[PDB]
Curated annotation (Swiss-Prot):
Organism: Homo sapiens (Human)
Glycosylation, residue list: T35
Topology term for the membrane: Lipid-anchor
N-acetylmethionine modifications at: M1
Name recorded for this polypeptide: GTPase KRas
Lineage: Eukaryota, Metazoa, Chordata, Craniata, Vertebrata
Mod. after translation: Acetylation at Lys-104 prevents interaction with guanine nucleotide exchange factors (GEFs). Lysine-depalmitoylation by SIRT2 promotes its localization to endomembranes in endocytic pathways.
Positions of modified residues (N-acetylthreonine): T2
Amino acid sequence: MTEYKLVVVGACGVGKSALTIQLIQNHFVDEYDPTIEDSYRKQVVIDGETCLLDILDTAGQEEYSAMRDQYMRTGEGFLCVFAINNTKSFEDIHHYREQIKRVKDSEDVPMVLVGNKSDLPSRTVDTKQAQDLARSYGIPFIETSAKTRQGVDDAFYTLVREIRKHKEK
Ligand SMILES: CCC(=O)N1CC2(CCN(c3nc(OC4CCN(CC)CC4)nc4c(F)c(-c5c(C)ccc6[nH]ncc56)c(Cl)cc34)CC2)C1
Ligand SMILES: Nc1nc2c(ncn2[C@@H]2O[C@H](COP(=O)(O)OP(=O)(O)O)[C@@H](O)[C@H]2O)c(=O)[nH]1
Ligand SMILES: [Mg+2]
């Protein structure tokens, strides 16, 4: 069983917890405590390889943490999540990638950009915006809904494949 340390980042309210819970429990939670930051485990077979995913769902404080660095340092892949009806959460992606790059000291970190809440009408971040950003970074963009579960497996499996492509697992 190979292990993969995944870290889910993004602004409050984008659906980091809901996405993780969908993967790890197959249900949609509508009010998961915003103060709970924890690691979760899922056993999945991905391309005939039994994987144990260790998924860190971030929460809490924003100011430069020194132990944030630590878990961020050992994470092998990062889901960068924004919500398509939250323009600021998309803008914040520049900052999350900047910070991930600094800690990993690389422009080549396994990362997937996730645009969540695709089930909601009248998005404020259009697909072109998200594609242009993912293309600039050289990473996949995946649209998700934690509500309907559409794209959830895609997002997490893709990230596992990005980790494999960067390093032997
Ligand atoms: C509602 C509860 C909830 O769901 N959560 C998720 C939550 C975690 C904390 N989070 C962050 N916020 C900001 O900065 C803020 C001011 C500046 N704007 C842009 C100008 C962006 C926002 N920086 C962050 C940051 F740098 C990192 C980070 C990274 C990636 C890598 C190495 C690192 N070492 N140390 C911090 C750090 C991390 Cl992990 C989170 C935030 C806010 C959102 C709280
Ligand atoms: N319509 C819709 N709501 C969502 C989706 N994902 C999360 N939510 C809701 O958005 C709010 C924040 O979700 P949460 O997972 O707590 O976000 P976090 O703060 O990033 O962990 C909650 O009310 C969730 O039920 C989604 O895909 N669609
Ligand atoms: Mg949460």
